[PDB]
Design an enzyme around this catalytic site. Structure first.
Site, mmCIF file in Angstrom:
data_model
loop_
_atom_site.group_PDB
_atom_site.id
_atom_site.type_symbol
_atom_site.label_atom_id
_atom_site.label_comp_id
_atom_site.label_asym_id
_atom_site.label_seq_id
_atom_site.Cartn_x
_atom_site.Cartn_y
_atom_site.Cartn_z
ATOM 1 C CG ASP A 141 -2.102 1.018 1.007
ATOM 2 O OD1 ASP A 141 -2.380 1.452 -0.132
ATOM 3 O OD2 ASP A 141 -2.689 1.398 2.041
ATOM 4 N NE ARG A 173 -3.900 5.496 0.382
ATOM 5 C CZ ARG A 173 -3.777 5.418 -0.942
ATOM 6 N NH1 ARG A 173 -3.649 6.523 -1.672
ATOM 7 N NH2 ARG A 173 -3.790 4.236 -1.540
ATOM 8 C CG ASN A 174 -0.108 4.244 3.825
ATOM 9 O OD1 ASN A 174 -0.707 4.496 4.872
ATOM 10 N ND2 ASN A 174 -0.542 3.352 2.948
ATOM 11 C CG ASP A 201 0.358 -0.200 5.916
ATOM 12 O OD1 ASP A 201 -0.714 0.428 5.774
ATOM 13 O OD2 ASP A 201 0.497 -1.384 5.544
#
Ligand SMILES: Cc1ccc(C(=O)Nc2cccc(C(F)(F)F)c2)cc1Nc1nc(N2CCOCC2)nc(-n2ccnc2)n1
Length: 273
Positions: free
Chosen positions: A135, A139-140, A153
């Site tokens: 992922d 945004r992480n 994460d």
């Protein structure tokens, strides 16, 4: 499981405000004593299942194993008391996606490329440690007050995911390389949405037909070429993270290489005398 983690006593932890949610408990901003240090705190609350407990302590275990400048740092864990907690460092600048959207145009190309080199070094470390992220997206990623990016994460991404991972669930460090290319595009655009208003099905169709994101504005030719290599349909043709780090290091250490810009394809042309 907790062998690279430090056990923290709950009397040293103060929770202040809810900042998000875990699988079975809230995430808070708080303070940690050992003067006081700001931290993020993920809880596992009463009633959690066995699988939730395994995943929670397993998460703390893997985070404790990671020790790298570009990976979020685990301060410690509370496992001997309830609620259980995972405690990490905290960044006032927050997550990279929102950071760049709130700071549009405020950085130099060299600063942006330096961010990408740090993200790539963290990913090279994870891949070397045999950890597949699955992922990776702006945004992480957290940004500290030195502009250093820390891969994290936060839990739950068609637009960031390689075709083989979508099609048949093959997640590897090479699908993480595809995601890294998307992150490069996010950084160089100051947080634009990949593929703009295309739907998830339209994105996958475009990718399968060979279309790729166009160059950001003001983007070094070398940087656009690198992101394009990350998006090769054939998994084996993509660069490894070691190759990415090496390329970015060389560009930064000879910064005139970044002055050559890829041609930006204008959507709108204005006619002026
Ligand atoms: C508490 C906490 C727990 C776990 C993780 C996390 O990364 N686990 C992880 C798991 C597997 C692999 C990796 C990896 F990548 F390293 F390999 C990392 C991060 C945070 N810490 C944290 N969580 C948030 N959240 C944002 C809102 O939603 C909830 C979470 N925000 C902030 N934060 C904000 C400003 N400064 C810090 N910190």
């Amino acid at each position: 499981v907790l062998k690279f983690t430090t056990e923290i006593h709950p009397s040293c932890v103060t929770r202040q405000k809810v900042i998000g949610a875990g699988e079975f408990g809230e995430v808070y901003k708080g303070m940690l004593k050992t003067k006081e240090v700001p931290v993020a705190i993920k809880t596992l609350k009463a009633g959690y299942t066995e699988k939730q407990r395994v995943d929670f302590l397993g998460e703390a275990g893997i985070m404790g194993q990671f020790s790298h400048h570009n990976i979020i740092r685990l301060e410690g864990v509370i496992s001997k008391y309830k609620p259980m907690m995972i405690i990490t460092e905290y960044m006032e600048n927050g997550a990279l996606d929102k950071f760049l959207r709130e700071k549009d145009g405020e950085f130099s190309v060299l600063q942006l490329v330096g961010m990408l080199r740090g993200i790539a070094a963290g990913m090279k470390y994870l891949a070397n440690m045999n950890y597949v992220h699955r992922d990776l997206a702006a945004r992480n990623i957290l940004v500290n007050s030195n502009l250093v990016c820390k891969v994290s994460d936060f839990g739950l991404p068609i637009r960031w995911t390689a075709p083989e991972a979508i099609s048949y669930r093959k997640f590897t460090s090479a699908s993480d390389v595809w995601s890294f290319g998307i992150v490069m595009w996010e950084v160089m655009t100051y947080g634009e949405r990949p593929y703009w208003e295309l739907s998830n099905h339209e994105v996958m169709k475009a990718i399968n037909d060979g279309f790729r994101l166009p160059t950001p504005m003001d983007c070094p030719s070398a940087i656009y070429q690198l992101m394009m290599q990350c998006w090769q349909q054939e998994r084996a043709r993509r660069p490894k993270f070691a190759d990415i780090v090496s390329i970015l290091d060389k560009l930064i250490r000879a910064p005139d290489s970044l002055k050559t810009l890829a041609d930006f394809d204008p959507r709108v042309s204005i006619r002026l005398p």
